[PDB]
Symmetry: C6
Subunit: 92 residues, 6 copies
């Protein structure tokens, strides 16, 4: 099950990211990760083509946030099961 | 139920943002989020017109905070229900 | 009941802020908030004129701190009761 | 048992580092450490040759993360047992 | 009872600050505060003359820490009792 | 009992620091301290000459870490017992 993630500077931009992602395709938002320096990431899971659709919509719609900025983004089609136990990418 | 958000650099400005928001319209302040680098966000919920009124007043009143600064802001008229269970935008 | 707050870069300056505020007028120190980046705020409650006296004394006396810096400050005369439940401005 | 570590700026890149590491060789991902300033490290354990294979693949695959950056990386073939009880490099 | 405080960038320098302070005079180290951005403060209590002796020796000894830096420092001879209940300056 | 500490920017360099220190002499690694800004310190205890040997090896071996940087370091031969109760330099 693919994982998609968008990392933004600022929390309003991240919420737009999460909303746009779950709206644009059949993905589940499973998490929100703060790592400091104002950097925050939202994580979704779903079929690779859906997750690809989600992430693309996310990066575009953040342009509608005043003071919005995307710092990074990425999709992994088939994450190894080891990640599910160590990183916060898992269904809760 | 719409969600409105103002992110400031500095805590005094966020308090003004929160105060102004709840006073300008029928919205509820539901949260305060710290993400580091001095960045703090206040979050309100309410009808989209009320939330829109709250956020514009917040951005304007932060200007009478000594050292106050708005970094970002945003409104989502109809956030997806999934957001309620993962992000701190909930009652 | 008014709320006053002074935000400094550095913890020694914030302690001077708290001390000067409770000394200069009839206000109660109710809180100390850290939001990262070395930014720290002290919060007092009291009558608006007292809180105004406190905050003014605070900003001046921080000039006596070696390496002291005030980043921001603010007073709200009559905060909405909603704030009491979400923000740490409350009588503990 | 060797320990391998890749530190990145940004969380998405750290996920790729972790995924690539466990896929490139017989290593176990045992941890994720945040130390502030956006710096995050993933830690694996395994035989030194496997760990060496895992870390080089991690550094290489981070390059297909939009906005990804490696800050540091390192392998210790035979870390001292004292490290296991103090640092998050264990189980 | 006076309070003295030295804030450094970096943890090794704060240890030297604490050590030097308790060795230079009859003060008690009561606390260590982290506020982010590498800024850490150590806090002692004692009579104002002792506390003054402790802080000046701290500032001076930090200079033999490789990579050490003092960011700020301060003494309050008679802090208000309200401070004891809100800030980490007391005997726990 | 002496205390030695090396502070690095980045976590991989700190692990090398800890490993090199416990390997180069008869010292115990007792702690790891994060204070933000990517700054992390490892702390060992032992006889002053051993601790001196450990810290020296630590700073040299960090040159073998890709992206490794030492920000500060320091040894205190005989730390005051007060520090043991306030700072994380203790046999936890």
């Amino acid at each position: 099950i693919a994982v998609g993630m968008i990392e933004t500077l600022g929390f309003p931009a991240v919420v737009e990211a999460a909303d746009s992602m779950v709206k644009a395709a059949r993905v589940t938002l499973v998490g929100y990760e703060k790592i400091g320096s104002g950097r925050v990431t939202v994580i979704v899971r779903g079929d690779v083509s859906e997750v690809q659709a989600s992430v693309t919509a996310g990066i575009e719609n953040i342009r509608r946030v005043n003071g919005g900025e995307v710092l990074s983004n990425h999709i992994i089609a088939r994450p190894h099961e080891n990640l599910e136990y160590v990183l916060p990418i898992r269904y809760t």
